[PDB]
Amino acid sequence: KSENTIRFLTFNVNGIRTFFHYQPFSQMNQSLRSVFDFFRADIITFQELKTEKLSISKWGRVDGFYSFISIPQTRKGYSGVGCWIRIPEKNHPLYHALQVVKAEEGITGYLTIKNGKHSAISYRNDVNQGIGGYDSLDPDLDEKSALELDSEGRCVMVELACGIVIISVYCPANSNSSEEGEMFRLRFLKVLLRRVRNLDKIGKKIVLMGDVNVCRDLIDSADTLEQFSIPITDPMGGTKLEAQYRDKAIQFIINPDTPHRRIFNQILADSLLPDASKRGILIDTTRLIQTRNRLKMYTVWNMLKNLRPSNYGSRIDFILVSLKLERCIKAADILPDILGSDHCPVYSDLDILDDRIEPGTTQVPIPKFEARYKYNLRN
Ligand SMILES: [Cl-]
Ligand SMILES: [Mg+2]
């Protein structure tokens, strides 16, 4: 790949310490820099760090990279998302593109940054630290419920120069199938997607990547294809399958027990459903480049049932980009031969130096010496 393209990589690593017990990462002495160089990646998110604060002195200190890590406040060994940004050298063509101007924890904006000695401020209340887009995320969202929604280390956001915002997510799965857990999962998804729409409307170019824990389509679900008695007869016959079984492909998304699938599809401009597609604002890079013909493009397999060897899985890991970035996409694929987890990695290469793409709306933090702050002028 080219020096002018940024390579994005997402990987649910099912515990970052365990991840380093798999080949080839077991030869790398737990060095994330070696891992990112192995992938030739520039912007990387890992989900399910399953780490703890004391271990951040390892995972948040990466030579040649900025580290942005969100973990639960107290619960150890659970969830956790990291996003790492390569620091380019002065003569690298990406020197300015990769400059990080803002970074933020959570989806709601209510989490805080230490401000003084005994002082913390929420992203929502500091325009020079928060990325913005906080309007009407949910009609009932108060601080207490927002902090609950953002308490499990599930989202990091980084803003680069030129208005690109990278949102790295590990969305809830409701593994227990509890009713409270389903409500939490749906609220998380809805807030996430409204935040995306707000930032898009303000003019940010968005990259939303990570483990969304939602199948967008029947062809991404080995279990439901079997349940519907639909066999994979042609490995590149995805479009024919979706045509001949369109009634089932629709049923899959609008299943009343799984409304998260329909909610997810509404953000996808390439959704199988025309109404969803008309209102969507994000492109599924992997589907765009691999096309809807490619079947069995799975990124997770149920490990307890040992189903990865038969490639019987689902696709719940994504790199989604603003419609305005679609022409930038040079490559997008999954990496199912790479070990490390019960998921496999997903990557996409974007040529964002392309001068034909509209520029994003930037908001570079204003230095505090600017007169409005230095002399506390009225706003
Ligand atoms: Cl699903
Ligand atoms: Mg796991």
mmCIF file of C-alpha atoms and ligand atoms in Angstrom:
data_model
loop_
_atom_site.group_PDB
_atom_site.id
_atom_site.type_symbol
_atom_site.label_atom_id
_atom_site.label_comp_id
_atom_site.label_asym_id
_atom_site.label_seq_id
_atom_site.Cartn_x
_atom_site.Cartn_y
_atom_site.Cartn_z
ATOM 1 C CA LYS A 1 0.000 0.000 0.000
ATOM 2 C CA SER A 2 0.959 3.665 -0.465
ATOM 3 C CA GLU A 3 2.494 6.174 1.929
ATOM 4 C CA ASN A 4 -0.386 8.526 1.075
ATOM 5 C CA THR A 5 -3.139 6.225 2.371
ATOM 6 C CA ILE A 6 -4.174 5.843 6.005
ATOM 7 C CA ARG A 7 -4.769 2.205 6.996
ATOM 8 C CA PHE A 8 -7.575 1.756 9.535
ATOM 9 C CA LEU A 9 -7.687 -1.459 11.548
ATOM 10 C CA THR A 10 -10.257 -2.773 14.030
ATOM 11 C CA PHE A 11 -9.854 -5.951 16.082
ATOM 12 C CA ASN A 12 -11.826 -7.327 19.007
ATOM 13 C CA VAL A 13 -8.892 -8.985 20.757
ATOM 14 C CA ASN A 14 -10.804 -10.918 23.457
ATOM 15 C CA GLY A 15 -8.378 -9.676 26.087
ATOM 16 C CA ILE A 16 -5.169 -7.986 25.036
ATOM 17 C CA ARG A 17 -2.908 -10.047 27.327
ATOM 18 C CA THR A 18 -4.379 -13.294 25.958
ATOM 19 C CA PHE A 19 -4.112 -11.881 22.420
ATOM 20 C CA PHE A 20 -0.312 -11.820 22.790
ATOM 21 C CA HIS A 21 -0.237 -15.607 23.317
ATOM 22 C CA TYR A 22 -1.109 -16.231 19.654
ATOM 23 C CA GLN A 23 1.356 -16.472 16.783
ATOM 24 C CA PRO A 24 2.947 -14.257 15.519
ATOM 25 C CA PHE A 25 2.180 -11.796 18.304
ATOM 26 C CA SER A 26 3.772 -14.167 20.824
ATOM 27 C CA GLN A 27 7.188 -13.273 19.353
ATOM 28 C CA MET A 28 6.678 -9.526 19.848
ATOM 29 C CA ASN A 29 7.274 -9.212 23.620
ATOM 30 C CA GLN A 30 3.838 -7.617 24.100
ATOM 31 C CA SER A 31 4.826 -4.675 21.882
ATOM 32 C CA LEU A 32 1.859 -2.910 20.328
ATOM 33 C CA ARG A 33 4.271 -0.993 18.090
ATOM 34 C CA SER A 34 5.415 -4.303 16.624
ATOM 35 C CA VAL A 35 1.756 -5.331 16.210
ATOM 36 C CA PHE A 36 0.801 -2.128 14.414
ATOM 37 C CA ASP A 37 3.901 -2.394 12.222
ATOM 38 C CA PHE A 38 2.918 -6.017 11.423
ATOM 39 C CA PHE A 39 -0.446 -4.795 10.161
ATOM 40 C CA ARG A 40 1.149 -1.738 8.505
ATOM 41 C CA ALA A 41 -1.656 0.165 10.219
ATOM 42 C CA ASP A 42 -1.956 3.869 11.008
ATOM 43 C CA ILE A 43 -5.191 4.181 13.013
ATOM 44 C CA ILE A 44 -6.008 1.118 15.124
ATOM 45 C CA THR A 45 -8.789 0.287 17.555
ATOM 46 C CA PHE A 46 -8.827 -2.834 19.735
ATOM 47 C CA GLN A 47 -11.923 -3.824 21.721
ATOM 48 C CA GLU A 48 -12.239 -5.993 24.842
ATOM 49 C CA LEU A 49 -8.858 -5.040 26.271
ATOM 50 C CA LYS A 50 -10.011 -6.753 29.491
ATOM 51 C CA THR A 51 -7.282 -4.837 31.255
ATOM 52 C CA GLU A 52 -6.909 -2.643 34.355
ATOM 53 C CA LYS A 53 -5.532 0.784 35.233
ATOM 54 C CA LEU A 54 -2.096 -0.434 36.332
ATOM 55 C CA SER A 55 -1.607 -2.215 32.996
ATOM 56 C CA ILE A 56 -2.201 1.010 31.066
ATOM 57 C CA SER A 57 1.438 1.865 31.710
ATOM 58 C CA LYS A 58 2.085 -0.783 29.047
ATOM 59 C CA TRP A 59 -0.818 -0.436 26.595
ATOM 60 C CA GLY A 60 -1.011 3.379 26.741
ATOM 61 C CA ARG A 61 2.724 3.994 26.128
ATOM 62 C CA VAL A 62 3.431 2.987 22.525
ATOM 63 C CA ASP A 63 6.564 4.306 20.851
ATOM 64 C CA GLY A 64 5.674 6.283 17.755
ATOM 65 C CA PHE A 65 1.946 6.350 18.577
ATOM 66 C CA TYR A 66 -0.618 8.302 20.549
ATOM 67 C CA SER A 67 -2.744 6.105 22.820
ATOM 68 C CA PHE A 68 -6.400 6.785 23.689
ATOM 69 C CA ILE A 69 -7.847 4.171 26.020
ATOM 70 C CA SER A 70 -11.221 3.884 27.777
ATOM 71 C CA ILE A 71 -11.816 1.230 30.448
ATOM 72 C CA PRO A 72 -14.475 0.824 33.149
ATOM 73 C CA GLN A 73 -13.711 2.957 36.195
ATOM 74 C CA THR A 74 -13.479 0.011 38.603
ATOM 75 C CA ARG A 75 -14.437 -3.280 36.976
ATOM 76 C CA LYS A 76 -11.258 -5.080 35.897
ATOM 77 C CA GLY A 77 -10.904 -7.598 33.099
ATOM 78 C CA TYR A 78 -13.988 -6.287 31.301
ATOM 79 C CA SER A 79 -14.685 -4.466 28.052
ATOM 80 C CA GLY A 80 -12.296 -1.608 27.267
ATOM 81 C CA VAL A 81 -11.509 0.084 23.962
ATOM 82 C CA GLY A 82 -8.243 1.553 22.722
ATOM 83 C CA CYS A 83 -7.500 3.704 19.681
ATOM 84 C CA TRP A 84 -3.918 4.305 18.567
ATOM 85 C CA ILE A 85 -2.714 6.926 16.092
ATOM 86 C CA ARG A 86 0.643 6.736 14.336
ATOM 87 C CA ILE A 87 2.858 9.803 14.763
ATOM 88 C CA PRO A 88 4.284 10.641 11.317
ATOM 89 C CA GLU A 89 7.745 12.026 10.761
ATOM 90 C CA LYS A 90 8.130 15.590 9.541
ATOM 91 C CA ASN A 91 8.738 14.619 5.908
ATOM 92 C CA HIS A 92 5.954 12.042 5.773
ATOM 93 C CA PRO A 93 3.097 13.053 3.429
ATOM 94 C CA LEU A 94 0.654 12.440 6.299
ATOM 95 C CA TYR A 95 2.439 14.804 8.707
ATOM 96 C CA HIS A 96 -0.535 17.151 8.933
ATOM 97 C CA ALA A 97 -3.339 14.689 8.175
ATOM 98 C CA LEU A 98 -2.547 12.582 11.237
ATOM 99 C CA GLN A 99 -2.270 15.470 13.703
ATOM 100 C CA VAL A 100 -4.671 14.844 16.595
ATOM 101 C CA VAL A 101 -6.546 17.969 17.698
ATOM 102 C CA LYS A 102 -9.150 16.494 20.055
ATOM 103 C CA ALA A 103 -9.931 13.225 21.834
ATOM 104 C CA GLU A 104 -12.911 12.174 23.934
ATOM 105 C CA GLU A 105 -14.194 9.269 26.029
ATOM 106 C CA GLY A 106 -17.711 7.848 25.765
ATOM 107 C CA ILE A 107 -20.660 8.604 23.499
ATOM 108 C CA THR A 108 -22.694 10.958 25.702
ATOM 109 C CA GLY A 109 -20.159 13.738 26.389
ATOM 110 C CA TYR A 110 -20.737 13.624 30.138
ATOM 111 C CA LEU A 111 -17.505 11.868 31.077
ATOM 112 C CA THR A 112 -14.876 14.220 32.410
ATOM 113 C CA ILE A 113 -11.266 15.325 32.070
ATOM 114 C CA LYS A 114 -9.263 16.403 35.117
ATOM 115 C CA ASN A 115 -9.255 20.206 34.922
ATOM 116 C CA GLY A 116 -7.386 21.375 38.027
ATOM 117 C CA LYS A 117 -6.421 19.760 41.306
ATOM 118 C CA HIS A 118 -9.954 19.165 42.640
ATOM 119 C CA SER A 119 -11.748 19.862 39.351
ATOM 120 C CA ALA A 120 -13.125 17.898 36.415
ATOM 121 C CA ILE A 121 -15.080 19.124 33.411
ATOM 122 C CA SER A 122 -17.333 17.200 31.058
ATOM 123 C CA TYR A 123 -16.622 17.191 27.345
ATOM 124 C CA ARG A 124 -20.130 18.634 26.858
ATOM 125 C CA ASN A 125 -19.230 21.749 28.853
ATOM 126 C CA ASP A 126 -15.843 22.557 27.236
ATOM 127 C CA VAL A 127 -15.949 23.399 23.521
ATOM 128 C CA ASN A 128 -12.152 23.255 23.316
ATOM 129 C CA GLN A 129 -11.977 19.682 24.574
ATOM 130 C CA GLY A 130 -15.252 18.107 23.478
ATOM 131 C CA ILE A 131 -15.721 17.203 19.827
ATOM 132 C CA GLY A 132 -19.318 18.459 19.845
ATOM 133 C CA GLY A 133 -22.572 17.141 18.432
ATOM 134 C CA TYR A 134 -24.304 16.731 21.807
ATOM 135 C CA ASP A 135 -27.763 17.997 20.870
ATOM 136 C CA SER A 136 -30.777 15.846 21.789
ATOM 137 C CA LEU A 137 -28.969 12.508 21.987
ATOM 138 C CA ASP A 138 -32.075 11.127 23.780
ATOM 139 C CA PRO A 139 -35.120 12.958 25.225
ATOM 140 C CA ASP A 140 -34.632 11.444 28.719
ATOM 141 C CA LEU A 141 -30.827 11.525 29.028
ATOM 142 C CA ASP A 142 -29.782 13.185 32.278
ATOM 143 C CA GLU A 143 -26.245 13.138 33.668
ATOM 144 C CA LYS A 144 -26.824 10.139 35.943
ATOM 145 C CA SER A 145 -28.195 7.901 33.178
ATOM 146 C CA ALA A 146 -25.620 9.204 30.694
ATOM 147 C CA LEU A 147 -22.773 8.289 33.052
ATOM 148 C CA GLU A 148 -24.331 4.838 33.457
ATOM 149 C CA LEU A 149 -24.453 4.417 29.667
ATOM 150 C CA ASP A 150 -20.800 5.513 29.425
ATOM 151 C CA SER A 151 -19.525 3.455 32.427
ATOM 152 C CA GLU A 152 -18.213 0.311 30.674
ATOM 153 C CA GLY A 153 -15.283 1.558 28.566
ATOM 154 C CA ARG A 154 -17.026 1.198 25.220
ATOM 155 C CA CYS A 155 -16.107 4.200 23.088
ATOM 156 C CA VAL A 156 -13.166 6.446 22.255
ATOM 157 C CA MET A 157 -13.303 9.332 19.796
ATOM 158 C CA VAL A 158 -10.332 11.058 18.144
ATOM 159 C CA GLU A 159 -10.570 14.159 15.934
ATOM 160 C CA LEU A 160 -7.825 14.723 13.378
ATOM 161 C CA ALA A 161 -6.979 17.875 11.473
ATOM 162 C CA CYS A 162 -9.333 18.655 8.577
ATOM 163 C CA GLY A 163 -12.442 17.519 10.433
ATOM 164 C CA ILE A 164 -12.103 13.729 10.432
ATOM 165 C CA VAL A 165 -13.567 12.076 13.547
ATOM 166 C CA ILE A 166 -12.716 8.448 14.295
ATOM 167 C CA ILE A 167 -15.256 6.754 16.585
ATOM 168 C CA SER A 168 -14.086 3.414 17.987
ATOM 169 C CA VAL A 169 -16.779 1.335 19.641
ATOM 170 C CA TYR A 170 -17.421 -1.896 21.503
ATOM 171 C CA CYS A 171 -21.235 -1.867 21.622
ATOM 172 C CA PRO A 172 -23.069 -3.936 24.275
ATOM 173 C CA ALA A 173 -24.040 -7.473 23.329
ATOM 174 C CA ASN A 174 -26.559 -8.318 26.093
ATOM 175 C CA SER A 175 -24.778 -11.634 26.564
ATOM 176 C CA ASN A 176 -27.016 -12.508 29.546
ATOM 177 C CA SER A 177 -30.108 -11.765 27.398
ATOM 178 C CA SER A 178 -31.542 -9.845 30.352
ATOM 179 C CA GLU A 179 -34.308 -7.331 29.748
ATOM 180 C CA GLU A 180 -32.281 -4.601 31.453
ATOM 181 C CA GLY A 181 -29.381 -5.583 29.218
ATOM 182 C CA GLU A 182 -31.467 -5.354 26.052
ATOM 183 C CA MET A 183 -32.699 -1.894 27.058
ATOM 184 C CA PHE A 184 -29.103 -0.806 27.727
ATOM 185 C CA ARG A 185 -27.941 -2.191 24.385
ATOM 186 C CA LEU A 186 -30.666 -0.357 22.466
ATOM 187 C CA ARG A 187 -30.118 2.923 24.308
ATOM 188 C CA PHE A 188 -26.375 2.692 23.609
ATOM 189 C CA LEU A 189 -26.942 2.118 19.895
ATOM 190 C CA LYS A 190 -29.468 4.935 19.553
ATOM 191 C CA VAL A 191 -27.301 7.483 21.349
ATOM 192 C CA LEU A 192 -24.281 6.403 19.259
ATOM 193 C CA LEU A 193 -26.154 6.798 15.973
ATOM 194 C CA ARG A 194 -27.659 10.166 16.923
ATOM 195 C CA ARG A 195 -24.196 11.410 17.890
ATOM 196 C CA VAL A 196 -22.957 10.300 14.443
ATOM 197 C CA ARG A 197 -25.825 12.131 12.714
ATOM 198 C CA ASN A 198 -25.148 15.285 14.739
ATOM 199 C CA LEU A 199 -21.427 15.311 13.871
ATOM 200 C CA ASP A 200 -22.177 14.615 10.206
ATOM 201 C CA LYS A 201 -24.630 17.561 10.186
ATOM 202 C CA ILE A 202 -21.972 19.858 11.694
ATOM 203 C CA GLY A 203 -19.623 18.845 8.877
ATOM 204 C CA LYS A 204 -17.289 16.212 10.379
ATOM 205 C CA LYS A 205 -16.137 13.326 8.176
ATOM 206 C CA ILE A 206 -16.720 10.216 10.262
ATOM 207 C CA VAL A 207 -15.021 6.853 10.543
ATOM 208 C CA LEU A 208 -17.102 4.626 12.832
ATOM 209 C CA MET A 209 -15.309 1.364 13.457
ATOM 210 C CA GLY A 210 -15.364 -1.480 15.888
ATOM 211 C CA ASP A 211 -17.511 -4.289 17.237
ATOM 212 C CA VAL A 212 -21.123 -3.154 16.891
ATOM 213 C CA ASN A 213 -22.433 -6.569 17.987
ATOM 214 C CA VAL A 214 -25.207 -6.356 15.387
ATOM 215 C CA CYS A 215 -25.592 -8.237 12.120
ATOM 216 C CA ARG A 216 -26.823 -5.860 9.435
ATOM 217 C CA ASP A 217 -27.822 -8.591 6.948
ATOM 218 C CA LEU A 218 -28.885 -12.221 6.677
ATOM 219 C CA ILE A 219 -25.862 -13.021 4.479
ATOM 220 C CA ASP A 220 -23.667 -12.091 7.475
ATOM 221 C CA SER A 221 -25.265 -14.771 9.722
ATOM 222 C CA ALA A 222 -24.381 -18.429 9.273
ATOM 223 C CA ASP A 223 -26.817 -19.495 11.987
ATOM 224 C CA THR A 224 -29.856 -17.740 10.499
ATOM 225 C CA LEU A 225 -29.056 -18.900 6.961
ATOM 226 C CA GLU A 226 -29.147 -22.473 8.295
ATOM 227 C CA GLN A 227 -32.266 -21.739 10.345
ATOM 228 C CA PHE A 228 -33.973 -20.524 7.152
ATOM 229 C CA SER A 229 -32.721 -23.586 5.204
ATOM 230 C CA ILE A 230 -30.781 -21.360 2.785
ATOM 231 C CA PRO A 231 -27.599 -23.112 1.582
ATOM 232 C CA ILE A 232 -24.546 -21.323 0.249
ATOM 233 C CA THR A 233 -24.303 -22.897 -3.227
ATOM 234 C CA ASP A 234 -22.025 -20.308 -4.903
ATOM 235 C CA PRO A 235 -19.391 -18.479 -2.811
ATOM 236 C CA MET A 236 -19.771 -15.299 -4.860
ATOM 237 C CA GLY A 237 -23.534 -15.731 -5.278
ATOM 238 C CA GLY A 238 -24.489 -13.223 -2.603
ATOM 239 C CA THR A 239 -26.621 -11.024 -4.846
ATOM 240 C CA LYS A 240 -28.546 -13.967 -6.253
ATOM 241 C CA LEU A 241 -29.140 -15.294 -2.735
ATOM 242 C CA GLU A 242 -30.470 -11.928 -1.554
ATOM 243 C CA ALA A 243 -32.707 -11.754 -4.635
ATOM 244 C CA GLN A 244 -34.176 -15.254 -4.583
ATOM 245 C CA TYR A 245 -34.521 -15.067 -0.770
ATOM 246 C CA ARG A 246 -35.229 -11.343 -0.487
ATOM 247 C CA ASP A 247 -38.288 -12.076 1.677
ATOM 248 C CA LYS A 248 -35.987 -13.750 4.221
ATOM 249 C CA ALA A 249 -33.286 -11.081 3.866
ATOM 250 C CA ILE A 250 -35.930 -8.516 4.831
ATOM 251 C CA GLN A 251 -37.415 -10.693 7.593
ATOM 252 C CA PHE A 252 -33.920 -10.907 9.089
ATOM 253 C CA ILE A 253 -33.594 -7.133 9.474
ATOM 254 C CA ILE A 254 -37.190 -6.410 10.597
ATOM 255 C CA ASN A 255 -37.460 -9.369 12.992
ATOM 256 C CA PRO A 256 -39.460 -7.887 15.925
ATOM 257 C CA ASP A 257 -37.275 -9.655 18.495
ATOM 258 C CA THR A 258 -34.128 -7.931 17.129
ATOM 259 C CA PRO A 259 -35.005 -4.262 16.419
ATOM 260 C CA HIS A 260 -31.325 -3.331 16.889
ATOM 261 C CA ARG A 261 -30.758 -4.713 13.360
ATOM 262 C CA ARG A 262 -33.310 -2.301 11.867
ATOM 263 C CA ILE A 263 -32.015 0.627 13.971
ATOM 264 C CA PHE A 264 -28.470 -0.134 12.773
ATOM 265 C CA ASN A 265 -29.517 -0.324 9.121
ATOM 266 C CA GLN A 266 -31.007 3.201 9.219
ATOM 267 C CA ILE A 267 -27.502 4.683 9.345
ATOM 268 C CA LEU A 268 -26.306 2.666 6.316
ATOM 269 C CA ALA A 269 -26.548 4.379 2.938
ATOM 270 C CA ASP A 270 -25.909 0.958 1.370
ATOM 271 C CA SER A 271 -28.639 -0.787 3.349
ATOM 272 C CA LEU A 272 -30.601 -3.523 1.620
ATOM 273 C CA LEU A 273 -33.793 -1.626 2.545
ATOM 274 C CA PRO A 274 -34.617 1.365 0.279
ATOM 275 C CA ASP A 275 -35.985 3.598 3.053
ATOM 276 C CA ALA A 276 -32.962 2.916 5.261
ATOM 277 C CA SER A 277 -30.588 3.504 2.327
ATOM 278 C CA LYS A 278 -32.256 6.827 1.463
ATOM 279 C CA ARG A 279 -31.681 8.158 4.994
ATOM 280 C CA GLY A 280 -28.325 6.484 5.633
ATOM 281 C CA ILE A 281 -25.137 8.520 5.919
ATOM 282 C CA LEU A 282 -22.406 5.881 6.370
ATOM 283 C CA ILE A 283 -20.846 3.391 3.944
ATOM 284 C CA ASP A 284 -19.828 -0.165 4.995
ATOM 285 C CA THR A 285 -16.310 -0.151 3.556
ATOM 286 C CA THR A 286 -15.873 -3.939 3.651
ATOM 287 C CA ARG A 287 -19.139 -4.543 1.789
ATOM 288 C CA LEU A 288 -18.388 -1.776 -0.685
ATOM 289 C CA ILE A 289 -15.050 -3.266 -1.791
ATOM 290 C CA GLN A 290 -15.790 -6.982 -1.313
ATOM 291 C CA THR A 291 -19.307 -6.460 -2.801
ATOM 292 C CA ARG A 292 -22.589 -8.033 -1.700
ATOM 293 C CA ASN A 293 -21.646 -11.150 -3.682
ATOM 294 C CA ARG A 294 -19.062 -12.397 -1.158
ATOM 295 C CA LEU A 295 -20.701 -14.882 1.190
ATOM 296 C CA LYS A 296 -19.261 -16.299 4.435
ATOM 297 C CA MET A 297 -17.425 -13.018 5.139
ATOM 298 C CA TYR A 298 -17.516 -13.679 8.867
ATOM 299 C CA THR A 299 -15.462 -11.929 11.549
ATOM 300 C CA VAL A 300 -16.548 -13.790 14.696
ATOM 301 C CA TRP A 301 -17.088 -17.446 15.550
ATOM 302 C CA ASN A 302 -18.480 -18.985 18.733
ATOM 303 C CA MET A 303 -15.326 -20.307 20.372
ATOM 304 C CA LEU A 304 -17.003 -22.460 23.032
ATOM 305 C CA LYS A 305 -18.711 -24.417 20.225
ATOM 306 C CA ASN A 306 -15.438 -24.506 18.221
ATOM 307 C CA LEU A 307 -17.025 -23.135 15.051
ATOM 308 C CA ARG A 308 -14.164 -21.143 13.516
ATOM 309 C CA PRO A 309 -12.578 -24.144 11.704
ATOM 310 C CA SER A 310 -15.804 -24.646 9.690
ATOM 311 C CA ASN A 311 -16.073 -20.815 9.183
ATOM 312 C CA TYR A 312 -19.567 -20.848 10.717
ATOM 313 C CA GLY A 313 -19.899 -17.367 12.183
ATOM 314 C CA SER A 314 -21.253 -13.860 11.810
ATOM 315 C CA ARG A 315 -19.991 -10.410 10.766
ATOM 316 C CA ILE A 316 -20.405 -7.834 13.562
ATOM 317 C CA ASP A 317 -17.166 -5.864 13.093
ATOM 318 C CA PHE A 318 -17.200 -2.832 10.804
ATOM 319 C CA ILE A 319 -15.347 0.149 9.394
ATOM 320 C CA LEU A 320 -18.043 2.626 8.348
ATOM 321 C CA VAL A 321 -17.256 5.970 6.686
ATOM 322 C CA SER A 322 -19.082 9.136 5.727
ATOM 323 C CA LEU A 323 -20.606 9.142 2.262
ATOM 324 C CA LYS A 324 -18.172 11.949 1.398
ATOM 325 C CA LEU A 325 -15.222 9.618 2.037
ATOM 326 C CA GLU A 326 -16.430 6.824 -0.247
ATOM 327 C CA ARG A 327 -14.241 7.783 -3.207
ATOM 328 C CA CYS A 328 -11.234 7.644 -0.829
ATOM 329 C CA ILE A 329 -11.574 3.896 -0.211
ATOM 330 C CA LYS A 330 -8.687 2.023 -1.834
ATOM 331 C CA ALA A 331 -9.052 -1.340 -0.057
ATOM 332 C CA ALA A 332 -11.297 -2.919 2.554
ATOM 333 C CA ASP A 333 -11.238 -6.561 3.632
ATOM 334 C CA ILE A 334 -11.408 -8.899 6.573
ATOM 335 C CA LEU A 335 -8.398 -10.939 7.764
ATOM 336 C CA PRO A 336 -9.791 -14.301 8.882
ATOM 337 C CA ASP A 337 -6.499 -16.198 8.768
ATOM 338 C CA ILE A 338 -5.068 -13.938 11.491
ATOM 339 C CA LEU A 339 -5.229 -15.394 14.990
ATOM 340 C CA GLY A 340 -5.463 -13.578 18.292
ATOM 341 C CA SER A 341 -9.121 -13.767 19.281
ATOM 342 C CA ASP A 342 -12.514 -15.276 18.610
ATOM 343 C CA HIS A 343 -12.882 -12.433 16.083
ATOM 344 C CA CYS A 344 -10.594 -11.603 13.186
ATOM 345 C CA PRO A 345 -9.330 -8.139 12.171
ATOM 346 C CA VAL A 346 -10.940 -5.773 9.651
ATOM 347 C CA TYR A 347 -8.974 -3.118 7.775
ATOM 348 C CA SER A 348 -9.575 -0.354 5.250
ATOM 349 C CA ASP A 349 -7.184 1.947 3.367
ATOM 350 C CA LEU A 350 -8.328 5.538 2.701
ATOM 351 C CA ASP A 351 -6.522 8.090 0.499
ATOM 352 C CA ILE A 352 -7.724 11.147 2.387
ATOM 353 C CA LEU A 353 -5.113 13.469 0.869
ATOM 354 C CA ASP A 354 -7.366 13.323 -2.222
ATOM 355 C CA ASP A 355 -7.946 17.007 -3.011
ATOM 356 C CA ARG A 356 -11.316 16.235 -4.662
ATOM 357 C CA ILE A 357 -13.100 15.451 -1.368
ATOM 358 C CA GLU A 358 -14.875 18.322 0.368
ATOM 359 C CA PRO A 359 -12.904 19.520 3.414
ATOM 360 C CA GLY A 360 -14.244 18.689 6.843
ATOM 361 C CA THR A 361 -15.291 21.290 9.399
ATOM 362 C CA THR A 362 -12.389 21.626 11.837
ATOM 363 C CA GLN A 363 -12.521 23.160 15.313
ATOM 364 C CA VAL A 364 -8.929 23.433 16.544
ATOM 365 C CA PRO A 365 -8.907 24.094 20.308
ATOM 366 C CA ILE A 366 -8.459 27.811 20.939
ATOM 367 C CA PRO A 367 -5.379 28.569 23.078
ATOM 368 C CA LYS A 368 -6.307 29.857 26.515
ATOM 369 C CA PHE A 369 -4.311 33.042 25.912
ATOM 370 C CA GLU A 370 -6.900 34.119 23.312
ATOM 371 C CA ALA A 371 -8.464 37.323 24.613
ATOM 372 C CA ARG A 372 -11.955 35.933 25.196
ATOM 373 C CA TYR A 373 -10.544 33.523 27.801
ATOM 374 C CA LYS A 374 -7.562 35.513 29.094
ATOM 375 C CA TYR A 375 -9.811 38.476 29.966
ATOM 376 C CA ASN A 376 -13.043 36.503 30.585
ATOM 377 C CA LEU A 377 -15.058 38.357 27.993
ATOM 378 C CA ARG A 378 -18.779 37.698 27.687
ATOM 379 C CA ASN A 379 -20.204 35.131 25.264
HETATM 380 CL CL CL B 1 -27.893 -9.246 15.422
HETATM 381 MG MG MG B 2 -14.847 -11.975 24.177
#
